[PDB]
Amino acid sequence: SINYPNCRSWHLGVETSNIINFDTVPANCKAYVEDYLITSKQYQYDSKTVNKEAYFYAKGLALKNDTVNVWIFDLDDTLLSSIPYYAKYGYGTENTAPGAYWSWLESGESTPGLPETLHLYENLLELGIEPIIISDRWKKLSEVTVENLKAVGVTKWKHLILKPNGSKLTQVVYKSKVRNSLVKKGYNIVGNIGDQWADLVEDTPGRVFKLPNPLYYVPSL
Amino acid sequence: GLSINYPNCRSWHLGVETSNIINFDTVPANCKAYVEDYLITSKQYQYDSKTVNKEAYFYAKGLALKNDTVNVWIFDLDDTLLSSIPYYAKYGYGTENTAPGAYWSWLESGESTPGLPETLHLYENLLELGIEPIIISDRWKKLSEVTVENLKAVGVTKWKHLILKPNGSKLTQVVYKSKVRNSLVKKGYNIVGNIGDQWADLVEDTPGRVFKLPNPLYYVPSLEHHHH
Ligand SMILES: [Mg+2]
Ligand SMILES: [Mg+2]
């Protein structure tokens, strides 16, 4: 229905949540997305600036020794990249069947790490902030997820939380349930990083950081 | 005072638009060329603004609005309907410190702020849908006459209310705007949309979908709306 004559303008719209609920990347934006994500290195530069901002904030906090100080991480497209998968399917311009990405993950296919986020993850551990990784992947994918994290140098976390098999919950509601259970256990959430605004609903404490993602959209509240 | 290093200006700008970067004091000195290029040379500002106003309009078109309900859309003024660019172009495009009051003094003298045509198109289209615009501005009341003149000059005339800030008020912009919006709710108005160039304009403590216009020039402190 809406034409997006300028692909950079569309992309800013999606990053700011001015444009929501897109099922696919606009066809005319395929080359922009590929060039953004790979050739131009703008995705890398954008990612580095976000992670650096998170770190400068994190290293200014006065952490108390008597509480569990935590930082929430998303997994897909925050720590691990789905780019090799999307690259085969037209960088988000094509429809993909639900469950297909998961099947791909089950096939022995590893995902590359996102090194700017991995640097942040390592920095937070050094500051004594405890990462909690919350993922919408089904619990059946636990072993393959742990293997992939190990392959990118992530082996320590306070919790790695996956979604109950065949859960009926939307991603936004499931992640809100998890964060609220964390608060309830007395954890002090100081920050939250993810590539979807759905990951970053401000219903629990901590500063939020939105990693770029032009490939796809997860509905929010 | 404390500098912060941003070797990629575009990454910096995306950070400020998303609110990953907040409360910057001035534009990074190395990003002067970028901002001038973004706002004027490249026309990217225009294309970005067009996209935002277009989504807003297609959203508004899709609402089922009752005739008997006062259905309103909130507009910001500066860098939403009227542009501060001619002022900032004098001061390194946000890279230099400007005394507080300096901008208001510049407006008071009757300096022109050009219209932002993409927002003006949205404003006109909303009137056609029977949605009544309300303009909420942090400009002091004493700027009411120059404000009305600059609005008339760019083709804006029918608003339900034009609300300026009490002279000398000690409220922050975010708090003042929230108090105004909340009073509109109490009046029984139905806010269906809200558009502005600062997150401070767009706190979701009152109803309506929010749309954030681009602005690399400055940052207005904001507050997060606690969800349940
Ligand atoms: Mg993700
Ligand atoms: Mg403004």
Residue numbers in the entry:
A (entry chain B): 51 to 271
B (entry chain A): 49 to 276
Provide passages from the article that reported this PDB entry.
In the current study, we presented the crystal structure of recombinant VSP1 at 1.8 Å resolution via the selenomethionine single-wavelength anomalous diffraction (SAD). The size and location of the cap domain suggests that VSP1 belongs to the classical C1 cap type of the HAD superfamily. Consistent with the known members of the HAD superfamily, the active site of VSP1 is located in the cleft between the core and cap domain. Based on the sequence alignment and structure comparison, the four conserved aspartate residues in VSP1 are Asp124, 126, 245 and 249. In addition, a magnesium ion is located at the catalytic center, coordinated by the carbonyl oxygen of Asp126, the carboxyl oxygens of Asp124 and Asp 245, the hydroxyl oxygen of Tyr266 and three water molecules. The dimer interface is built by residues from both core domain and cap domain.
In addition to their potential nutrient storage function, they were thought to be involved in plant defense and flower development. Based on protein sequence motif analysis, Arabidopsis VSP1 and VSP2 are classified as acid phosphatases of the haloacid dehalogenase (HAD) superfamily.
